[PDB]
Each structure stands twice: as structure tokens, then as C-alpha cells.
RNA sequence: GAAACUGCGAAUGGCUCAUUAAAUCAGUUAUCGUUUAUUUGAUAGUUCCUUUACUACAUGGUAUAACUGUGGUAAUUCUAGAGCUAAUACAUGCUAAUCUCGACCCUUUGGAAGAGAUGUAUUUAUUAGAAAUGUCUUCGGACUCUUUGAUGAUUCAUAAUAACUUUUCGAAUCGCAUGGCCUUGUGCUGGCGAUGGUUCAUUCAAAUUUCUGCCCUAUCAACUUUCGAUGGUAGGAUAGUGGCCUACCAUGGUUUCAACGGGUAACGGGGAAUAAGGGUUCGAUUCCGGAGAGGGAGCCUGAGAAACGGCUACCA
């Protein structure tokens, strides 16, 4: 977890060594709302992610989308593919189209290429990432 | 000359973007303030709106908090020891947030004897490492403020896992 | 120059501050009484 | 633009003011105030194009500078002051008291009221929060911040405000069967009783309203204004009683 | 002297072991100047946040100083207060000195001592002439003004009242920090006469609600064996007054708990003198009579336990040998039934 | 009431369509991601705290314009030296309170011996923010307990503890008028307004931002990444999110569902013409939104500008 120059910690969560009441490091978490069950892996996990929707300083608000994971080769985020049909009126016919959306995935989720993920909008995480995985299936 | 605009950057696809418009004031940036240890020099900066930002060009004293004891004292900042982002800042003793720095231990020590009457005992017990630094006379602290914005260098004394990790890195 | 009008203005300002404080205290007491009624 | 705008084209002005398109090139831009720009009636339009007491802008200015016009019990001298919904306009010289309520057509109507009714107004509770020093307060649709409110008051309820003191005399909860006035959308101006409140988390809530004539319609919660219990409104209603 | 650079210089110039700190040889010449400088800053009226911080900074540098210099700083505070005449005579206040100016002066002195005690705590250097001697005089003035002054001068009566409140608090502070280290045999008689004695009559009537500084003073004497001579003065008036608080109908649970804890300490700390035997009999017999009513008033389980800790104490030293002690102990116990192992052992 | 200082405005209005091909723009979202002059509504008694050796019946030039007078230049909405004088300019700085309990009397319209408590603003750390089914009573009532709010959702609203600050604010301002108490003092008190001021909310707004939608071209098939391209973390900067930039890391991101590159006599839309319907073409042009002020670049002021009927350089 401390695989870096800088120490990873949940901000403003203080662990008083003197009291030493419990072995486990105190961990702060929240529920994201809209009936999205926070997985237990987040509650009893040890990872630290400022962009996680359940333990980080990020809120899910706005559109909620669903897609299929197309790429998962990059650190803590994936690329999903949303497919749809665009309507051409002149020919009165449909046309298959698609768009790639990069989405941040918290380590609390284990996502493979091919599974269906429901993602919620959040504040701009990176240059292209504006969504956060909130449910996997 | 400094701008934060995203239009000059390439698109996600790899396409580049033609100049949509001239640079705007509401998307500006200002020169970094490499705060360094020394006699206090701070000058104000008029920012967007009527607000003001304080720029710390030099500073030598700052308020540091002992969280375990729940106290805060004003102490002299001696020198920068380790900075995670970049090490030439450590070389130049540049002060910024998250920089690990060394502070003199006299005020905390004096408060320790005053409160607990010891250079009761169970409460007076502290970490072995923290006592070792007291014996040294110098304490490792992490700066929690942003000197380039607020003009302060507040921080907190390292403890427990923080202190152990940074000692391993040192 | 020191003139009676300046003294009158100063006295009025002080009286206004006192009256505002008194009115705020009365409002706070009324709200506390209402909560006591509800509980 | 490099700053806030200060002009308004007549074609760009709100439709419901009913401004002649050929009279001129510009329309009165409402100044900042209790009500939003698009949901407000500036005093110049009300005094000139509705009551016809003034024939031109200069006459309206002369009327206002005489301090003959009171808005919610306070004298206003701004020609473009944004009077709005449930606003009380008093003209003592004419012995006239008006309440701004939209008609079935969807326009502000010249509705005369008695002094007793003019002594108060109704405000939709837009927000309830604790201020500094832990003092609770409510913010209404007209920008009034009222401290020490009743705890039972919540968002979307309606508070009866006494103009003289600016305090809460009574309140009406948002609940099924309550009498409701529509202040937005195509159903603007209609009156009906609540039937059901559809709640969608993270989205706009929808309210079903049923008129006296048995017709039903669905409107967003933001356009809803509770005005009393069915058959017993707390304010005199305009002609037609918000039907059709 | 410069206000903008005042606080930074205190850390750099005055901090112990500092690189820019005054050399040990030069301390004697420079420090007297430094004390006068800081004394001037300590007189700033704390009306704003910045001004409060400046006052805190001035008092916070004292631990850096060596104790003789710290004692010098306190002497400067007490120099203006004229106290030699009061203890020079048989502890009588001059009418001329009784003025709002003097009351304002002692108020400033007491506040500085309170701040110094908070920062130094156990390391606070206590001396008769520098600190304690003026301290007792100030509380004497507060009593003298309060009784003698007429109701018309409401402001003067208020200023005297605050001085007594701060003065008593300033006392109870110094007892708790340096009471044991300092030997009070010399000043014990004056302190009782000038502070404790005048208020002894009503002490029960005054402190029913919450513990007061004067009550905290008596408790501190009850706990420490060396200071029992205070409790011996004037036929155990101070001790007798403690139980009159207990004997009162309207004593609350906040005041009740500490006193029985203090009574237990007196009961559990033997002292070799005739007065101690008389005291414990007065402590014990007085406590036993009122205890059943006391139990009803308690609302805390811990407050229940401390009575049992007192009851079990009385059995250990054999006071239960007396029939009256045994009977009243039994009457108190049946109320408790009307910890369990402690009760059983007592039975 | 000329002139001048101060305050505000001059960032609106008007004109044009050069650049711009997921850009602008249309519809639709978000700010739990941030600034907001102004309008509107609320909002600030901190009593005390030693040199009281004391201005608040009110402090300075730490100061100048207009003005007087002596001058330079061919010339400009150019200005130098000397002498003056004001503030809602500039810089300083103060003046016997309220609230908890309340013994004791007294039993209420009660008195109060006494024990206690005391603004804001910035920075950091920490903390809070979740079988009383009885008894009596006058039949009423009393006896013990409760004790934050909101969102779908938060480290939210709010409060508390310890310190911190070249650190702010907490009225040294103005018009009209002369009422009320008396111990008769140029004593005490007092009306209606104007202008300012901290914080919150509202309003006019601004900046980013979610999803979908653009003409021709495949005889443009691979593109982006050395000089940031994709993401991680930490810092800097920003009003703020963010590779926006910096340091170290991984090797990523788009594409035959047409990426990338090329053309466009390409500002987009509401709309206009034609057509029986499908369609095809036009839209600089009365409204909305974007950009520009000969071409690039950078800036002071201010809430708001990369301003051009504002400023500085370079090119012509
Ligand atoms: Mg919402
Ligand atoms: Mg192109
Ligand atoms: Mg787009
Ligand atoms: Mg204005
Ligand atoms: Mg001159
Ligand atoms: Mg960052
Ligand atoms: Mg780099
Ligand atoms: Mg073109
Ligand atoms: Mg066009
Ligand atoms: Mg236009
Ligand atoms: Mg422009
Ligand atoms: Mg030209
Ligand atoms: Mg320009
Ligand atoms: Mg021009
Ligand atoms: Mg222009």
C-alpha cells in the first residue's frame, strides 16, 4: 500500500498511537447513494485511493451510464465502450455507432475485459476521466 | 506567460487543437514562490475578486501541532530533510506542503515537563522514537500548510506509521 | 469640529447597538421557549 | 461578453409581459432583486402597460420619486425593481392594493385585494439551514431570510409572512390533498389539489395535480407553490380560479 | 519593541540554546532590560485576536528563562502593589489604599500570575516576597472593599468581586502545582486568617451548587497529610464547615462527590497528633448522620461506589467498635440496599 | 457654484464574420468543483484585565491636487522647481454589560449572599456532528429521562479545544429637524434619512462540465509519445476540478462503427426557398450564443478585460 515516495493516508483521519484502542487502522468510508451497496472490501480494505467513491473525497452526481469494459491495462482506471444506434432519416434506417469512455475504478472492484459496469459521473479526475465505476457485474 | 488552458494540449485521440481564441485572464497562472528558510519576507498578491493571497518568499518560524498530546506550539524551522515530490527542493531547502522538515524541540519539551512533571507516568509514556528525537533536540515534522498560497508553514509532528515510513525513506 | 450633532450621532449609534442586542436576546428566548413547548 | 450585460432587446424580453414589438428597440431590463429576471414584472411595466397610470417612462419615474408606490410595505424608487410572484404592491393615493398572481393565460393579472389581505404574503420555503452561532433560518422564494423558524417547517412548505414585522405567522406543509398553484411551465397559472409526489433520487421530482374539473396533470416540483387546503386557499384567487 | 517583528524575535532571540540566544556571560546585563520590555507588552489590553496572541506569547517565553530571572519578572508585577505595610502591621488595610486604582492594579497582577501558573505549572517558582505575599494582600483588599463599600458604587463592588474570584482561583492553582514542594509553615497562620477565616461562617451556604476554588482549597488540604494544620485551626472550623455543606438540604451531586473523597483520605491517612484524633471523630460522626439522605441524591454509579469506599474504610480502622458508629453505618448501608462484594465484606 | 480630489461608470452599447470541422453551436446535465461589483433579506453591547504617567466633547502629514508664483520644448489631453490647504482620499486609534444556576428568606409580578461563562477574520491539528403501565395532587398539575438539522450521497450546515498571522473587521462620516427629562447645567436623553462595514443567503453574472448531434476526402491507414501523448502519486499555480506545469513512475490513449492528415468562396442555431411526399439548396444580414478590433506577444487598473474610441515591444 505504501509503494511510493509519499505516504498514502486518508486525510484528516487521525490514529492516536497513545490510546492504541484497536489494532486495525481507523478507516473512513461512505455510501454513494442511489441504492449502490458499498462493498465490504472497501469497509475492511487497506487500500488508499483519494478518487475512490466509497473512501475518497469524490461524490457521484449527475448522469449514470452502463458499458462493457474494453481495456483494463492501465493503473486504477479502465476504458469502457458504449454502443448505440443512430437514426438516419433520409434512408429511414439505423446505423451502429460506439464511443469509448475512460472510467476510474477503485481497487475495491475487480474488473475483467468483457464484464458490464455501471458508472457514475463525478468531478474531473484527470484529463479524460470524468466517471467512476460504482457497480460491476 | 503562464496559462492553465486545456486548449493548447492535444486531444485524447491524439489530434491537436487549433487556436480557438486568445489567452484569457480568468485562466492565468503566476510564477512559483520557492519559499526558503530565512528572515520573514511575505508580500501580498491581488487575486481574482477582492480576495488576497499571501506569498511566502522567506519564512523561519511556524506553528506545529503535536496531535497525540493535542497541543500546538510556535517553533523555528531548521531545515528540509526529505520531500516526496522532488529532491532538488530538499537540496535548496525549499519549503512546500508535504515536505519533511526539522524543527527545534525546546517548546514541546518544556511543555512536556510542565504538564507531566517528568523529563501519571503511564500517561506520560510516549513513543520510543519521539523520545529519541527529544534527546536529539530536533523533531521531524510534516508541513500541512501551503506556503505559496496562505503565507504560513503550519504542520504536525510525525508519529507512528508516518514517522516509521519516513525514517525508512531517510 | 466637535458639535452637538456629532455627539447626537454617536449617542444614536450606541443606542441602536444596544437595542439590536436586546431584540436579538428576546428573539432567542422566544425560540428557546417554543422548543421547550415542543419537547 | 467581458462582464454582466445591461441591455435587453424587446424580442428577447419575456413573452408574458406583452410588450409591443414596434414601440421601440429595447425593453426594461429588471434590476437585481428578490425575483429572477424571467419570473419578474418590473415596476415600469406594471405601472405603464398594465394599470396605465403612466403614459411614458418619465412619468413612471416621477410617480416613483413621489414615494407613492410601496412593495411589500417598503417604498421603492427603482423603475426596474423586479416585483414578482406573491408580491404586494400598494398605492395609498389611489387606495389600491394588488397581489401579483398569474392568470390562466399565464400572465401577471391586475388583482385587487383588501388591506387585511395585503397585510401578509406567502413564501415557498426554498431552504432551511443553521446559520452562524447555531441560529436556524429559512430562505423563501423571494430571498427573505427569516431566523428562528418553527422546526416543523421544511423545504417546499409555505410560510405566511407578516409584511410589517417580517415574521412567520403560520405555515402549511407539503402533502397530498393540499391546494397548489403552478408557477412554471405550460401549466403555469393553474390551481389544483396534490394527488401524488413522484420522487426520483438524483433527479427532478414530479407532482401530480388534479383540478376541480377532474383533469389531471404532472409538473416538476420546482413549479409547485402550496397556497392552502383544498377549498380554503389562504389568499384571494383571481377570476376563473385557475381553471383550464 | 517593533510590533511587526515582535513575535518572530521571541522565538529566534529568546529560545533556549538558540544560535542567536544571549551568551551565558551576557545574561546578567541584558536580561533585566528584556524583562522590562516583555512587561510592557503584557499590559496590552486583549481586545482582539492579535492582541490576545501577543499576551500569550509574552507569558509563553518565561520557561525559556532561568528561575532567578522568572522570579525577577514576578517581582516587577508585584512592585507597584504596596503590601509591606499590611503585613508590617497586624494585617490591617489602610483606607487610603482602598481605591479603584489599586483594585485595577491587583487585578492585573493576579491575571499575570494565573497565566504564569498555567504555563510553568509545577516548575513555577513560588516565593513569599515576590508572589505569595502580594497575593494574600490582594484577596484581603477584595474582602475589605466588599464589606466596607456601599451599594452606590456598583462598579467598585464588581471590580472587588472579580479580584476575589481571580484571587481565590490564583491561590487554588498555586496549591495544586507547588503546594507539596513549598513549605508553608511560616505563612500558614496568615493565609487562614486573611483568606479562610472571614468566609468560614457562610461557606456552607455559598458553595452548594458546584465546587468552588475555596472548596477546592479545603479538599487539597484534606488530601495532603502535611497541610492538616489548616484543618486544625479554630476548633476545626474549616473541617466543620465542609460537612455543613454536606448537612445542607440542597447540596448537589457535583459538590458532594469530592468532599467524601476528601473525607475518606483524612480517614485513611493517620497523623500523629491530638488534633487528628478529634478531627476524624468529627469527620466520621458528621458524615455518618447525613449519609442516607446523600445516597438518594446521587445519580452516578461511581458516586455510589465512593460512599462504599468510605464505608469500607471506617470498618478497617475499628471505628465500628463504637455502637453509635456501627448503628449509623448500618443505617446508611440499608439505604444503599434499599460493589456487591464490598457490601458483603462490610456485612 | 467654475476648477480639482474622491466614488461610480467606461468590461454595456454598436459593427464584422478573419480564425474555428466534436471546435463553436442546439438540446440536455453538474458545481458535494469555484469567483461574484450591484439589488434584496438577515447579521457584530465581547464588563474587566498594573506605567490611569490616559485624546474620544474625536488623532496625524508619516500630504497632496485644484490655487499663487518662477520655467523648459518647434510641437502633444507633455510637464519641472518652490509655496499653500481639505476628505466617506491616506495612516492611526478608544470610550459600569449580558447569561446560567441559585442557598437563604418569602410563597409571589418575588429579592439575591454567592459559585460560574464571555467577539469576529486567516492557517494548521484535533473533537462532536447518534412495565414511571408508578406516586400523589386541588384533578388540573408535579415528581425521573429526553436534547442538534439537511441531502440519494459527504471530511455538509454548525459547534468545541490549542496555538498561528508584516493580517483584517468591530462607524474618528454626512443632510433635515429641535422633541422629552429634570438637581437649570451650552447637563442627561431623543426623531426621520443618506453613506459605509464582517459573514451568510438571494439576484444579475462568469468559468469549467456530463450525453447526443457537423459538409467534401481512403489515389489520407495507421496516428499520438524524444520537445506530455494515456494514467498513478506528490507538489506548484489557479477562484477552483484537472498533465494546466513541475519531479519520479509505469506504457499507455484513438482507429475500417473511418482515427490521423488534406479542402472548405465553414461563425452555429432560431430560420428562408422549393417540393405532393420523401428530399435538395441558402442562412454575412433585425433574435440568441462564440470570436475580433491591421498581424503576433505581454500587461496595469478593476468585481468583472488578456480591453485595444487602455497601456508596452516587435512586424507592415
Ligand atoms: Mg440535485
Ligand atoms: Mg482540418
Ligand atoms: Mg462535445
Ligand atoms: Mg452602482
Ligand atoms: Mg510642493
Ligand atoms: Mg493535485
Ligand atoms: Mg515531466
Ligand atoms: Mg471564413
Ligand atoms: Mg447567420
Ligand atoms: Mg450578435
Ligand atoms: Mg474582445
Ligand atoms: Mg481595416
Ligand atoms: Mg488586445
Ligand atoms: Mg475606432
Ligand atoms: Mg470598444
Q: How many angstroms separate the CA of E244 from the C1' of F90? A: 67
How many Å from the CA of C20 to C1' of F175? 24
Q: How far is the CA of A32 from the C1' of F288 (A)?
A: 39
Q: Chain E residues with CB inside 8 Å of B104's CB?
A: 15, 17-18
CB contact at 8 A, E283 and E271: no
Class of the CATH domain delimited by D174-244: mainly beta
Question: Is residue D117 classed as helix, strand or coil in its secondary structure?
Answer: helix
Angle E236-E242-E247 (CA atoms, 0-180°, nearest 5)?
Answer: 115
Place of cell 417554543: C34
Q: Are chains E and B touching, using the cut-off of 8 Å on CB pairs and a minimum of 3 such pairs?
A: yes
Q: Which nucleotides of F are covered by protein (CB under 7 A)?
A: 10-14, 19-24, 29-33, 35-52, 57-58, 94-99, 101-104, 113-117, 119-127, 145-146, 148-155, 157-159, 161-171, 173-178, 187, 189-193, 199-214, 223-224, 228-248, 250-261, 278-280, 286-293, 297-299, 301-308
Assess contact for B142 and B100: CB atoms under 8 A.
yes
Q: Which residues of chain A lie closer than 8 angstroms to D201, CB-CB?
A: 33-35
- CB neighbour class for E241 (10 Å; exposed up to 12, middle 13-18, buried from 19): buried
Q: Is-contact D163 D142, C-beta < 8 A?
A: no
Residues of chain A with C-beta less than 8 angstroms from the C-beta of B68 = 16-18
Instruction: Identify from B124, B167, B169 which residue to disrupt to test chain A contact, counting A C-beta atoms within 10 A and taking the largest count.
Output: B169
Q: Which three cell numbers stand for residue A15?
A: 490514529
Asked if residue D33 keeps its beta carbon closer than 7 A to nucleic acid strand F, the reply is yes
- CA dist., res. D126 & res. D132, Å (int): 19
Distance in angstroms: CA B6, C1' F242: 9
* Domain D1-116 of CATH type 3.90.650.10: no
Q: Do the beta carbons of residue A78 and residue A102 sit within 8 Å?
A: yes
Query: Among partner residues D148, D150, D151, which is closest to C27 by beta-carbon distance?
Result: D148
How far is Cα B32 from Cα E328, in angstroms, rounded to an integer? 81
Other CB atoms within a 10 A radius of the CB of residue E247 amount to 16
Residues E96-131: b if buried by 16+ CB within 10 A, e if exposed: ebbeeebbebbbebbbbbbbbbebbbbbbbbebebb
Are residues D19 and D10 in contact, defined by beta-carbon separation less than 8 angstroms?
Answer: yes
Instruction: Report yes or no: C35 at the D interface, CB cutoff 8 Å.
Output: yes
Q: How many domains does chain A have?
A: 1
d(CA E145, CA E102): 11
CA–CA separation, E260 and E345 (whole Å): 20
Q: What is the span of the domain harbouring residue A84?
A: 1-137
The three cell numbers locating residue D183: 408557477
Contact flag, residue C38 CB and nucleic strand F, below 7 A? no
Q: In the numeric block, which cell numbers belong to residue D129?
A: 439551514
**Which of D201, D202, D203 is the best residue to mutate to test the A interface, defined by the most A CB atoms within 10 Å of its own CB?**
D202
Please tell me which residue lies nearest to nucleotide F242, judged from CA to C1': A126
**Shortest distance, CA D234 to any CA of chain C (angstroms):** 24
Å from the A121 CA to the F242 C1'? 15
In Å, how far is B143's CA from the nearest CA of chain E? 19
Nine-digit cell string for E86: 499590611
The Cα–Cα gap between B62 and D130 comes to: 34
In angstroms, this model's resolution equals 3.9
What's the B122 CA to ligand 14 centre distance in angstroms? 82
Q: Which residue of chain A has the CA closest to D200?
A: A34
Residues 6+ away with beta carbon under 8 Å from A110: A136
The secondary structure element, H or E, covering residue D132 is: none
Inter-chain contact C28–D150, Cβ cutoff 8 Å?
A: no
Distance CA B167, CA B102 (A): 13
Q: Where are the alpha helices (DSSP H) in D75-231?
A: 115-118
Q: How many Å apart are B25 CA and F303 C1'?
A: 14
Strand F closer than 7 Å to the CB of B46?
A: yes
Give the Cα separation of B45 and B57 in Å (integer). 12
- Closest nucleotide to the alpha carbon of B25, via C1': F306
Closest nucleotide over all strands to D5 (CA to C1') = F12
* Angle at alpha carbon of residue E258, lines to B120 and E209, rounded to 5°: 130
Give distance in angstroms: CA of E312 to centre of ligand 9. 100
Residue A2 CA to residue B166 CA, distance in Å, equals 11
B67 near A CB under 8 A: yes
The Cα–Cα gap between D97 and D99 comes to 7
Nucleotide nearest E104, CA–C1', reads: F50
- Location of C-alpha cell 519578572: E73
Interchain CB distance below 8 Å, A127 and B166: no
D174-244 has the same fold as D1-116: no
Q: Are strands D178-182 and D224-229 parallel, antiparallel or unpaired?
A: antiparallel
Measure the CA–CA gap between B142 and E63, rounded to whole angstroms. 26
Q: Is the CB of B67 under 7 A from strand F?
A: yes
Using the C1' atom of nucleotide F29, identify the protein residue whose alpha carbon is closest.
A62
CA distance E31 to E206: 46
Hey, what's the cell of E101? 486604582
Query: Please, how many CA atoms are within 13 Å of residue E332, restricted to the half-sphere of its CB?
Result: 26
For residue E247, give the nearest of E287, E303, E276 by alpha carbon: E287
**All chains having 3 or more CB pairs closer than 8 angstroms to chain E:** B
CA distance A67 to A100: 9
What is the distance between the alpha carbons of residues A54 and A47, in angstroms, rounded to a whole number?
12
SS3 E214: helix
Residue C20 beta carbon within 7 A of nucleic strand F: yes
- Rounded distance in angstroms from the CA atom of residue D33 to the C1' atom of nucleotide F38: 10
* All three cell numbers of B36: 526558503
Cβ of residue C32 closer than 8 Å to a chain D Cβ: no
State how far Cα E286 lies from the chain centre: 25
Q: In what order do the strands lie in the sheet with B35-36?
A: B41-46, B52-58, B35-36, B94-95
Distance CA A7, CA B142 (A): 11
Q: Is A72 helix (H, G, I), strand (E, B) or coil?
A: strand
Nucleotide F113 C1' to residue E205 CA (A):
8
**Bridge partners, residue D185, by sequence:** none
> Backbone phi, then psi, for B33, in 5-degree steps?
-105, 100
Contacts of C30 in chain D (CB under 8 A): 148
Decide: A100 and A80 in contact? Cβ < 8 Å. Answer: yes
Protein residue minimizing CA–C1' distance to F169: E48
Cα E106 off chain centre by? 17
How far is Cα E184 from Cα E308, in angstroms, rounded to an integer? 34
Chains D and A touch, using 3 or more CB pairs below 8 Å: yes
Domain extents for chain D? 1-116, 121-171, 174-244
Alpha helices in E15-48 (DSSP H): 27-42
The chain E residue lying nearest B118, using CA atoms, is E122
Enumerate the residues of chain D whose CB falls inside 8 A of the CB of residue C28.
135, 148
Q: Which three cell numbers stand for residue A106?
A: 477503485
Nearest Cα to E180, choosing from E230, E216, E227? E227
Cβ neighbours of residue E305 under 8 Å, at least 6 residues apart? E339
CA of A38, C1' of F231: distance in angstroms: 25
Count, in order, helices (H) and strands (E) of chain B: 6, 9
Report how far ligand 2's centroid is from the alpha carbon of B18 (Å).
9
CATH number, domain with residue A101: 2.40.50.1000
Question: Residue E284 corresponds to which cell in the numbers above?
Answer: 466520621
| Closest CA relative to residue A136, chosen from A79, A69, A48 | A69
d(CA E36, CA E57): 15
Residue B15 Cα to ligand 3 middle (Å): 15
Segment (H or E) for D210: strand D206-210
Expressed in angstroms and rounded, the spacing between residue D3 Cα and the centre of ligand 8 is 27
Q: Nearest 5°: CA angle at E192, between E186 and E195?
A: 120
Chains that touch B (3 or more CB pairs under 8 A): A, E
User: Residue A16 and residue B68: Cβ atoms within 8 Å?
Assistant: yes
State yes or no: chains A and E have 3 or more CB pairs below 8 A. no
d(CA A121, CA A132) in angstroms, rounded, equals 6
Structural biology method used: cryo-EM
- Cβ of B39 near strand F (under 7 Å)? The reply is no
Q: Taking each helix axis from N to C terminus, what angle separates E6-14 and E49-60, rounded to the nearest 10 degrees?
A: 10
Gap between the Cα atoms of E27 and E296, Å rounded: 63
- Distance from the Cα of D199 to chain A's closest Cα (Å) equals 12
Helix (H) or strand (E) holding D200: none
* Cβ atoms D193, D242 nearer than 8 A: no
In CATH, the number for domain D121-171 is 2.40.50.740
Start-to-end CA span in chain B (Å): 38
D174: number of Cβ within 10 Å: 20
Give nearest nucleotide to D74 (CA–C1'). Answer: F40
Amino acid at each position: 500500500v505504501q509503494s511510493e515516495r509519499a505516504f498514502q493516508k486518508q486525510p484528516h483521519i487521525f490514529n492516536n498511537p497513545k490510546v492504541k484502542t484497536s489494532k486495525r487502522t481507523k478507516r473512513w468510508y461512505k455510501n454513494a447513494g442511489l441504492g449502490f451497496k458499498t462493498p465490504k472490501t472497501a469497509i475492511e480494505g487497506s487500500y488508499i485511493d483519494k478518487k475512490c467513491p466509497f473512501t475518497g473525497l469524490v461524490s457521484i452526481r449527475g448522469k449514470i451510464l452502463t458499458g462493457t469494459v474494453v481495456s483494463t491495462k492501465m493503473h486504477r482506471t479502465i476504458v469502457i465502450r458504449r454502443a448505440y444506434l443512430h437514426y438516419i432519416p433520409k434512408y429511414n434506417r439505423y446505423e451502429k455507432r460506439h464511443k469509448n469512455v475512460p472510467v476510474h475504478v477503485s481497487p475495491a472492484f475487480r474488473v475483467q475485459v468483457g464484464d458490464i459496469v455501471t458508472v457514475g459521473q463525478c468531478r474531473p479526475i484527470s484529463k479524460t476521466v470524468r466517471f467512476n465505476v460504482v457497480k460491476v457485474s | 506567460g503562464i496559462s492553465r488552458d486545456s486548449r493548447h494540449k492535444r486531444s485524447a485521440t491524439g489530434a491537436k487543437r487549433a487556436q480557438f481564441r486568445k489567452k484569457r485572464k480568468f485562466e492565468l497562472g503566476r510564477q512559483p514562490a520557492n519559499t526558503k528558510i530565512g528572515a520573514k519576507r511575505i508580500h501580498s498578491v491581488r487575486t481574482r475578486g477582492g480576495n488576497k493571497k499571501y506569498r511566502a518568499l522567506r519564512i523561519e518560524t511556524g506553528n506545529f501541532s503535536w496531535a497525540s498530546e493535542g497541543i500546538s506550539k510556535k517553533t523555528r524551522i531548521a531545515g528540509v530533510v526529505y520531500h516526496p515530490s522532488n529532491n532538488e527542493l530538499v537540496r535548496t531547502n525549499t519549503l512546500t506542503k508535504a515536505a519533511i522538515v526539522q524543527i527545534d524541540a525546546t517548546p514541546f519539551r518544556q511543555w512536556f515537563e510542565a504538564h507531566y512533571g517528568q523529563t501519571r507516568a503511564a500517561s506520560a509514556k510516549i513513543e520510543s522514537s519521539v523520545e529519541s528525537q527529544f534527546s536529539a533536540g530536533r523533531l521531524y515534522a510534516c508541513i500541512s500548510s501551503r506556503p505559496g498560497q496562505s503565507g504560513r508553514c503550519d504542520g504536525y509532528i510525525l508519529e507512528g506509521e508516518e514517522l516509521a515510513f519516513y525514517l525508512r525513506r531517510l | 469640529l466637535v458639535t452637538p450633532q456629532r455627539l447626537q450621532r454617536k449617542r444614536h449609534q450606541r443606542a441602536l447597538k444596544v437595542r439590536n442586542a436586546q431584540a436579538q436576546r428576546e428573539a432567542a428566548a422566544e425560540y428557546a421557549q417554543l422548543l421547550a413547548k415542543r419537547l | 461578453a467581458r462582464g454582466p450585460k445591461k441591455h435587453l432587446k424587446r424580442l428577447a424580453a419575456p413573452h408574458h409581459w406583452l410588450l409591443d414589438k414596434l414601440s421601440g428597440c429595447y425593453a426594461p431590463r429588471p434590476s437585481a432583486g428578490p425575483h429572477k429576471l424571467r419570473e419578474s414584472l418590473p415596476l415600469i411595466v406594471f405601472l405603464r402597460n398594465r394599470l396605465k397610470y403612466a403614459l411614458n417612462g418619465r412619468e413612471v419615474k416621477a410617480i416613483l420619486m413621489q414615494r407613492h408606490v410601496k412593495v411589500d410595505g417598503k417604498v421603492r424608487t427603482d423603475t426596474t425593481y423586479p416585483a414578482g410572484f406573491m408580491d404586494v404592491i400598494t398605492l395609498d393615493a389611489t387606495n389600491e392594493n394588488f397581489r401579483l398572481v398569474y392568470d390562466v393565460k399565464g400572465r401577471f393579472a391586475v388583482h385587487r385585494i383588501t388591506d387585511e389581505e395585503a397585510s401578509y404574503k406567502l413564501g415557498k420555503v426554498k431552504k432551511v439551514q443553521l446559520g452562524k452561532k447555531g441560529v436556524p433560518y429559512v430562505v423563501t422564494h423571494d430571498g427573505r431570510t427569516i431566523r428562528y423558524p418553527d422546526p416543523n417547517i421544511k423545504v417546499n412548505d409555505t410560510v405566511k409572512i407578516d409584511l410589517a414585522s417580517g415574521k412567520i405567522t403560520d405555515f402549511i406543509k407539503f402533502d397530498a390533498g393540499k391546494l397548489v398553484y403552478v408557477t412554471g411551465g405550460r401549466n403555469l397559472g393553474r390551481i389544483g389539489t396534490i394527488v401524488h409526489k413522484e420522487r426520483h433520487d438524483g433527479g427532478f421530482d414530479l407532482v401530480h395535480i388534479k383540478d376541480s374539473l377532474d383533469n389531471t396533470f404532472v409538473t416538476r416540483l420546482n413549479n409547485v407553490f402550496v397556497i392552502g387546503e383544498q377549498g380554503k386557499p389562504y389568499i384571494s384567487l383571481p377570476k376563473g380560479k385557475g381553471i383550464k | 519593541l517593533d510590533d511587526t517583528l515582535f513575535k518572530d524575535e521571541i522565538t529566534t532571540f529568546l529560545t533556549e540554546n538558540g544560535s542567536q540566544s544571549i551568551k551565558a556571560e551576557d545574561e546578567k546585563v541584558v536580561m533585566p532590560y528584556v524583562l522590562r520590555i516583555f512587561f510592557g507588552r503584557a499590559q496590552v489590553p486583549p481586545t482582539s485576536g492579535q492582541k490576545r496572541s501577543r499576551k500569550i506569547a509574552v507569558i509563553s517565553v518565561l520557561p525559556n528563562f532561568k528561575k532567578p530571572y522568572i522570579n525577577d519578572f514576578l517581582s516587577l508585577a508585584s512592585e507597584r502593589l504596596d503590601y509591606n505595610y499590611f503585613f508590617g502591621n497586624s494585617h490591617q488595610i489602610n483606607s487610603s489604599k482602598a481605591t479603584l486604582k489599586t483594585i485595577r492594579r491587583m487585578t492585573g497582577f493576579v491575571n499575570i500570575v494565573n497565566s504564569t501558573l498555567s504555563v510553568l505549572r509545577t516548575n513555577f517558582p513560588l516565593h513569599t516576597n515576590s508572589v505569595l505575599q502580594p497575593l494574600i494582600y490582594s484577596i484581603a483588599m477584595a474582602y475589605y472593599v466588599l464589606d466596607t463599600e456601599s451599594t452606590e458604587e456598583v462598579h467598585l463592588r464588581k471590580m472587588a468581586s472579580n479580584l476575589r474570584q481571580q484571587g481565590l482561583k490564583c491561590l487554588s492553582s498555586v496549591f495544586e502545582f507547588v503546594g507539596n514542594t513549598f513549605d508553608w509553615s511560616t505563612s500558614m497562620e496568615d493565609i487562614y486568617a486573611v483568606v479562610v477565616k472571614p468566609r468560614i461562617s457562610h461557606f456552607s451556604d455559598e458553595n452548594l451548587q458546584q465546587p468552588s476554588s475555596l472548596l477546592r482549597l479545603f479538599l487539597y488540604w484534606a488530601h495532603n497529610p502535611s497541610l492538616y494544620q489548616f484543618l486544625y485551626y479554630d476548633e476545626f472550623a474549616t473541617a466543620t464547615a465542609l460537612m455543613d455543606t454536606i448537612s445542607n438540604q440542597h447540596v448537589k451531586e457535583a459538590v458532594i462527590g469530592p468532599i467524601i473523597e476528601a473525607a475518606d483520605s483524612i480517614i485513611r491517612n493517620p497523623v500523629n497528633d491530638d488534633h487528628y484524633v478529634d478531627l476524624v471523630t468529627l469527620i466520621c460522626t458528621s458524615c455518618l448522620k447525613i449519609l442516607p439522605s446523600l445516597y438518594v441524591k446521587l445519580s452516578d454509579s461511581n458516586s455510589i461506589s465512593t460512599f462504599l469506599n468510605l464505608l469500607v474504610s471506617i470498618t478497617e480502622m475499628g471505628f465500628i467498635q463504637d455502637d453509635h458508629v456501627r448503628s449509623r453505618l448500618i443505617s446508611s448501608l440499608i439505604s444503599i440496599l434499599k460493589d456487591t462484594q464490598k457490601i458483603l465484606k462490610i456485612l
